[PDB]
């Protein structure tokens, strides 16, 4: 119908109007479309081959002519020229693609199925023509200019961010996908970023202090994320973040370590938190921080304890409070800066155990059992009256902290024994700061200890309660008594009972015989205290004394001087006890005669003068505590041996034949909640068991034991 030559002259003019963007007539569009339609309608044998070559030539010429204009432009010049030319070209290309839609519907679709790879849609043809003609000569200049603009923006200036976005969009769309963007822009971007940040980091660390570099680095990383969000493709996020993290932190970790040590020496919570946030982003880079923290906590604990010296050995409060302060400061540091990380709490726990179970005090006492003993003594000091009623809120916190410290002690049996003894002594003499404290401590011990120890403590409480009820009931039937069971109290039991209390003794014996049958009462006199009324003194004196002191002050009424050889027979007391109590009497400034001999003369200091009527001559004996410590330690050792032997028998009675390492491991994990045994003790127990015909060694296969009935 219509030949190609008839329309090409008008078609060229029409297409020229599409470019050089102006108002586009609402009818010229269809006027141009109709020529294409009439040309395209005149084995398939399609028609639209010739128009494609002419369109390609036209776009070729247009791109070359427009490239001649801006071959020698500068940074802002190339950016602008490229941006407006790209926008105009994209718009005009889309319009032209719309004009010639018939070709796209039939001819290119036919040629694509055949296998010809040189045929594209007209829009894709325009894009590929742009890429082949204009992109190649100007890519280096545009990229370098964009990089210079970005570098200027990095030094604190302000740039036209819309210029870079157009270039990035043009690069992304020209991948006919991200092929061009990665190999034309990202490579140079990430190559220049490394150099810039390297020189910036070196210069910053050369002059400024290391603490501010962390803030600088975090600001830099946040700025990089914002930049990628605002005028770059989203795919660059991970690569840019990784490269920046590398170049900013991984090279400087070596000095970061020393900075961490210095900021550990002087407390700086926020800075440590910032360092934790920074070094966290490096994979497997937090280990050195954990090791340094553990070593620092250990050394700080040892240094703090060693400072006190000889005083801390006999002062439970100072010894406990040093440890508590060292634990508390670093625990708060771990909660705040490091956000409850498992590794850091593990390091703190290990360090705390290390300096709690071995320090300067333990070397002074030549044993590792002094720490639980001092902790028990501190609890006893807290729970006594001590010249001031404690506040309930403050006492509970101290008890909770003590329970926290108790967790890191390996030898818990010593603490249990000493606490039991001290609680018994407190309950018998009735001097407790508050009952709520005893209840809370019993509850905590229930939670964090065994069931036999708790049973014994509860039985002690029950006995004291029933004794109080019995005393209240018996008061009306008529001085106080404390009736206790036999095996539930630790006290281990020669006294001329004065006639002043003989009637009460007989009355109470008759009462107990009447109420209960078959039960014999054993009387402990060294733990009984009361009051006295006296006549032959300056005036009415009231004094507090032990029952032995009661007898030895009531033994003399009208006589003054006595010879202790006869006094021993009079009072029925052994040598050492009588000598110690006489030394106590002399130390009380209430008697007149330190070496005691059976012929020594001791008199009474008549007209004794005292500052206050309320006098308590029942002072605690100094040597009694030192004598008791060795006895209770020996008892603890014997109990340890018995438990080890029982555990070995129990473990061998289930596994008939076992080696050495498995046996030791099983014993250690079975006894891990009470104490940590020593290998020589286990070996000695095994050797004893073999001797006593309980288990034998199999012939051959040495270092192996077998159960024998």
């Amino acid at each position: 119908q219509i030949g190609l030559d008839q329309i090409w002259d008008d078609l060229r003019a029409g297409i020229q109007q599409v470019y050089t963007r102006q108002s586009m007539a609402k009818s010229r569009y269809m006027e141009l479309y109709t020529h294409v339609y009439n040309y395209c309608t005149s084995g398939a044998q399609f028609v639209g081959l010739e128009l494609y070559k002419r369109l390609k030539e036209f776009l070729k010429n247009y791109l070359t002519n427009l490239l001649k204009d801006g071959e020698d432009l500068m940074d802002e010049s190339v950016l602008k020229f490229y941006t407006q030319q790209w926008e105009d070209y994209r718009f005009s290309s889309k319009v032209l693609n719309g004009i010639c839609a018939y070709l796209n519907r039939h001819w290119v679709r036919r040629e694509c199925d055949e296998g010809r790879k040189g045929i594209y849609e007209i829009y894709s043809l325009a894009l590929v023509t742009w890429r082949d003609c204009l992109f190649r000569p100007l890519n280096k200049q545009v990229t370098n200019a964009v990089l210079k603009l970005i570098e200027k923006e990095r030094n604190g200036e302000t740039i036209n961010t819309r210029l870079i976005s157009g270039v990035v969009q043009s690069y992304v769309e020209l991948g006919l996908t991200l092929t061009v963007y990665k190999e034309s822009f990202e490579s140079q971007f990430l190559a220049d970023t490394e150099r810039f940040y390297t020189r910036e980091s070196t210069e910053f660390l050369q002059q400024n202090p290391v603490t501010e570099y962390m803030k600088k680095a975090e600001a830099r990383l946040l700025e990089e994320q914002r930049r990628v969000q605002v005028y770059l493709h989203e795919s660059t996020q991970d690569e840019l973040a990784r490269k920046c993290e590398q170049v900013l932190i991984e090279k400087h970790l070596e000095i970061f370590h020393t900075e961490f040590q210095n900021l550990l020496d002087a407390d700086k919570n926020e800075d440590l938190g910032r360092m934790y946030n920074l070094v966290s982003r490096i994979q497997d880079g937090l280990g050195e921080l954990k090791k340094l923290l553990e070593t620092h906590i250990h050394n700080q604990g040892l240094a703090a304890i060693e400072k006190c010296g000889e005083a801390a050995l006999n002062d439970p409060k100072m010894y406990v409070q040093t440890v508590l302060d060292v634990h508390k400061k670093y625990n708060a540091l771990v909660m705040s800066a490091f956000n409850n990380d498992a590794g850091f709490v593990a390091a703190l726990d290990k360090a705390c155990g290390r300096f709690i179970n071995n320090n300067a005090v333990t070397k002074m006492a030549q044993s590792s059992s002094k720490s639980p003993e001092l902790l028990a003594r501190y609890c006893d000091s807290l729970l006594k009256k001590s010249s001031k009623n404690p506040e309930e809120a403050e006492l509970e916190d101290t008890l909770n902290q003590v329970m926290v410290v108790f967790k890191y002690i390996e030898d818990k049996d010593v603490f249990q024994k000493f606490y039991a003894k001290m609680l018994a002594k407190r309950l018998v003499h009735q001097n407790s700061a508050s009952d709520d404290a005893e209840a809370s401590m019993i509850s905590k011990l229930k939670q964090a200890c065994g069931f036999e120890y708790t049973s014994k403590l509860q039985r002690m409480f029950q006995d004291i309660g029933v004794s109080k009820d019995l005393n209240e009931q018996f008061k009306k039937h008529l001085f106080s008594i404390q009736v206790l069971s036999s095996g539930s109290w630790p006290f281990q039991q020669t006294f001329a009972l004065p006639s002043e209390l003989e009637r009460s003794y007989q009355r109470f014996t008759a009462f107990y015989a009447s109420r209960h049958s078959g039960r014999k009462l054993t009387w402990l006199y060294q733990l009984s205290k009361g009051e006295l009324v006296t006549n032959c003194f300056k005036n009415r004196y009231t004094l507090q004394a032990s029952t032995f002191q009661m007898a030895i002050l009531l033994q003399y009424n009208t006589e003054d001087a006595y010879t202790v050889q006869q006094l021993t027979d009079s009072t029925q007391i052994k040598m050492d006890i009588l000598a110690q109590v006489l030394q106590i009497l002399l130390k009380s400034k209430l008697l007149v005669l330190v070496e005691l001999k059976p012929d020594t003369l001791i008199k009474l200091y008549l007209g004794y003068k005292n500052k206050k009527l309320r006098v308590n001559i029942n002072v605690p004996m100094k040597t009694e505590q030192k004598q008791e410590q060795e006895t209770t330690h020996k008892n603890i050792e014997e109990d340890r041996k018995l438990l080890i032997q029982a555990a070995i028998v129990r473990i061998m009675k289930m596994r008939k034949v076992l080696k050495h390492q498995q046996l030791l491991g099983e014993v250690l994990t079975q006894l891990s909640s009470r104490f940590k045994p020593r290998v020589p003790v286990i070996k000695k127990c095994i050797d004893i068991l073999i001797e006593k015909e309980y288990l034998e060694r199999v012939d051959g296969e040495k270092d192996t034991y077998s159960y024998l009935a």
Partner: peptide
Amino acid sequence: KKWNAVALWAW
């Protein structure tokens, strides 16, 4: 005056 003694009961 007043006295506080302690004793244990056993079989």
